[PDB]
Design an enzyme around this catalytic site. Sequence first.
Site, PDB file in Angstrom:
ATOM      1  N   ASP A 345     -83.860  84.191 132.701  1.00 19.88           N
ATOM      2  CA  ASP A 345     -83.949  83.889 131.283  1.00 19.88           C
ATOM      3  C   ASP A 345     -84.252  82.399 131.167  1.00 19.88           C
ATOM      4  OD1 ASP A 345     -83.372  84.315 128.340  1.00 19.88           O
ATOM      5  OD2 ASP A 345     -81.732  82.946 128.849  1.00 19.88           O
ATOM      6  N   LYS A 346     -84.815  81.973 130.035  1.00 17.72           N
ATOM      7  CA  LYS A 346     -85.313  80.602 129.932  1.00 17.72           C
ATOM      8  C   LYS A 346     -84.350  79.658 129.218  1.00 17.72           C
ATOM      9  CE  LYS A 346     -87.985  79.357 126.793  1.00 17.72           C
ATOM     10  NZ  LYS A 346     -87.479  78.103 126.180  1.00 17.72           N
ATOM     11  N   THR A 347     -84.012  79.947 127.961  1.00 19.24           N
ATOM     12  CA  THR A 347     -83.263  78.998 127.140  1.00 19.24           C
ATOM     13  C   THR A 347     -81.813  78.939 127.599  1.00 19.24           C
ATOM     14  OG1 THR A 347     -84.705  79.594 125.291  1.00 19.24           O
ATOM     15  CG2 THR A 347     -82.734  78.314 124.795  1.00 19.24           C
ATOM     16  N   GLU A 421     -90.468  67.015 117.527  1.00 20.50           N
ATOM     17  CA  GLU A 421     -90.510  65.888 116.601  1.00 20.50           C
ATOM     18  C   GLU A 421     -89.242  65.049 116.701  1.00 20.50           C
ATOM     19  OE1 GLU A 421     -91.089  68.116 113.093  1.00 20.50           O
ATOM     20  OE2 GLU A 421     -93.271  67.883 113.060  1.00 20.50           O
ATOM     21  N   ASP A 670     -77.511  83.548 129.419  1.00 16.06           N
ATOM     22  CA  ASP A 670     -76.380  83.114 128.612  1.00 16.06           C
ATOM     23  C   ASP A 670     -76.669  83.416 127.150  1.00 16.06           C
ATOM     24  OD1 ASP A 670     -78.261  81.101 128.011  1.00 16.06           O
ATOM     25  OD2 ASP A 670     -77.199  79.571 129.150  1.00 16.06           O
TER      26      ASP A 670
HETATM   27  F1  ALF Z   1     -84.780  84.243 125.835  1.00 12.03           F
HETATM   28 AL1  ALF Z   1     -83.547  83.057 126.332  1.00 12.03          AL
HETATM   29  F2  ALF Z   1     -82.295  81.897 126.845  1.00 12.03           F
HETATM   30  F3  ALF Z   1     -84.789  82.142 127.224  1.00 12.03           F
HETATM   31  F4  ALF Z   1     -82.300  83.973 125.454  1.00 12.03           F
HETATM   32 MG    MG Z   2     -79.585  83.821 125.584  1.00 14.23          MG
END
Ligand code: ALF
Ligand code: MG
Length: 929
Positions: A345-347, A421, A670
């Site tokens: 996963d990324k975020t 920004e 997460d």
């Molecule tokens: F899709 Al994500 F952290 F990258 F919930």
């Molecule tokens: Mg998440």
Amino acid sequence: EREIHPDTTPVYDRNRYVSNELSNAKYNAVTFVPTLLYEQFKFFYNLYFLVVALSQAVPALRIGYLSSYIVPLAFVLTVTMAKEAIDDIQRRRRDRESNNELYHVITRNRSIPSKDLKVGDLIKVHKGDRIPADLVLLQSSEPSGESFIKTDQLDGETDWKLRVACPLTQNLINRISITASAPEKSIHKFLGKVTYKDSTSNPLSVDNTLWANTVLASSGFCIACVVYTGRDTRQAMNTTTAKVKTGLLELEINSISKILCACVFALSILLVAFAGFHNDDWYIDILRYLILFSTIIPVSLRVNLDLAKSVYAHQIEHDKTIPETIVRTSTIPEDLGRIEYLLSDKTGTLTQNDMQLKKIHLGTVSYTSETLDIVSDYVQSLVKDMSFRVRDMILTLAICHNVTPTFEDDELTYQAASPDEIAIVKFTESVGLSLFKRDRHSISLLHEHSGKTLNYEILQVFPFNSDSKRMGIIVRDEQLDEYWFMQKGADTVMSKIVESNDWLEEETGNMAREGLRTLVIGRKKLNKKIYEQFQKEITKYLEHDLELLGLTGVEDKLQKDVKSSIELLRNAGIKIWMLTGDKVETARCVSISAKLISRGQYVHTITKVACLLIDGESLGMFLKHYEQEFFDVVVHLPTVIACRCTPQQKADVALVIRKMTGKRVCCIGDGGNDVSMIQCADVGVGIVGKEGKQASLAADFSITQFCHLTELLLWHGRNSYKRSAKLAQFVMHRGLIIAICQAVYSICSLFEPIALYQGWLMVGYATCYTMAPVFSLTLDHDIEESLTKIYPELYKELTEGKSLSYKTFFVWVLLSLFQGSVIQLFSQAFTSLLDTDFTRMVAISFTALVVNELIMVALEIYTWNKTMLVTEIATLLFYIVSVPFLGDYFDLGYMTTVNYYAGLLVILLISIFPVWTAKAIYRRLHPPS
Ligand code: ALF
Ligand SMILES: [Mg+2]
């Protein structure tokens, strides 16, 4: 439909709606025993020793002590109930440590915990505080009535969502009725109505609502009314109910246990048929012999497995190299060792969710965070040509944005729906020209530096749009009275429209190869008359010809050792995917910066109503219709990247991977949008360290960052699987070798196989004299934790399943055949079998068995600790001093004979020389690396 009056406390407090108490525990008090017993005695290798123990209830199948088949059944029951009871109470403790967060209620006039919160109590929720439940904004601190909610843990987004207060109620304090729709799974939809006195219905939408695990920003406080709570929230209804997870090694042991049961049934039928079908009860004979042969493996295997899993959990959650790691499902610590697909996963998982303007480039020269003093002394001269270009670049960076600043005692705060920004304005203040007071409704901007506070009233702003990739302004300077048009935007859109420059594409590609979100900036000096011609009035006139000031490189900060972690997890044969609820462009930038997409390596892209990069709706439709074809296409690509994914979509991707291949799927993340991806995985890993930890609560494991997954898979799980496989090997070996000795005694003397080891001897072999060196094997590893980074390919050597397979099970069976036949037949040869030499014969046979097991344990040790060199000597000395004092009746003999010890030496050398020479030649033919 759901009607809420903020003041009528009893009607919602007593009943009519779900409580805010969330539950992670699986079993309650009423259904702790039936559910656990049922899901534990579904498999064969549990039901088998359950039937073995229940056989002795009938007073004809009694083989020996009742204290031998019922006390280990009680022991496995005690260990199982203890393990899942500890797991449930730890789940409850972990969950109640986050159900006591204090929130202020308007009517109650005191801070109450989150579980105490019900539907319809007005919370004055502040800036840095996590949102309690699905709130609806009825009033905001700012006179405009808007605030920036932050949903990195609702979905995977990385920008802030502008949520406005209800315009009819933001001025209001009076009681205001809410009527919302029934809860759904729509994370981007809301349908409600605000009702005031005199029947004034009003509309509600997604733009005036906060949700379960959001974090507020861009206010000091806001009054919001809870509408959905508990399991009716948008967060907890995008989640599927968790299911029990049985490891792959569990299934392998189940299969080889089925084959072992067939083998011992065949051996018993062979024994009775060789006897001659006498005694008038041949069926009772085969059943009794089967109970004799199959009561030492199926129950010792379970105790060894369970205590090994407890040891694995303790070893995992006490690692200094992986601090603050928590094992929340102790039944599967060995699925970590055979993982073929990783669904990352990324975020938050990969990124820190903290973007920063790393690099600025203009005029074929660049500045970075390093050497920021030169640009600082450039901007401080605002109140040869390169200095003016830098100053005007900084001015355009600090004016063209849409960032709202608000004031504290110090440390001024920035508030924008696009955090790049915010990175820009933080960069400008670090260089020296800071954003200050902005109207953003009327026309004003304040900017002070080491000199005097300037002011630039704006003339017009064109809002950022998803189909435009641009933000443009016209601004009026106060001091010099100059009209300026300043625009920032994407490379592809401003490249054709900025100027006739010669160096744009090269540097845009150069920094886009590093995953930097590049924006190019242009400036156009204007006078009055063209501005009033513009104001007389589509988009053709406003963009005619600019001048390229430069371009900005804004990086998305990655977590500690993300690129190295991905490189080693792909060097170990794990195919890392990346499913995210964020935008396409930021996902691509993070993939390139983390080297999920390497140099070159052309990337394909799909958006419907090498590498891969697919949108959420396209992937959802593809998995809804074209399952097999698309999935067979994507398994050969190195990395598949998904964007805008519903939690259901990530869960379905994990399900499809583990269904169409039969491989094990790890899922790290997460926040609550990857809880379903974690619960529907084969291993669920969560990450903590920020405001939200709700995925780690529902996960199977928990680590503080992403770098820890490397050693959670490559060293802890791999060792767990290897040790469990070797443990099963040794337990089945000792059971099979005693069964073979009994069967050889039965063929060589027609009495019974039962009459060989009676009373104490069989119990002592099953428990006292053998169970400790197997747990000695539980504490062994081939390579240390310091070298799990240099050699990821070791994780590839367990891919086939060459540890618990039918072939290696039958190799164990043949080794048991050979060694048990040698032990029994050489015992009969040296002791000259009769009815008076029975005691000496069984004595030499049992001693040969015990020392054979204790040497075979010492042959399969890579590195020797002091917790293994002592638990073998302890058991050997226990057997030595346990012959006269606790025995004396069974297996009694002289044993103070020189010929007996030579006979034991021969009977053991013949049994341990094939194994030693086989492993010697296999180590000299296949050296490890
Ligand atoms: F899709 Al994500 F952290 F990258 F919930
Ligand atoms: Mg998440």
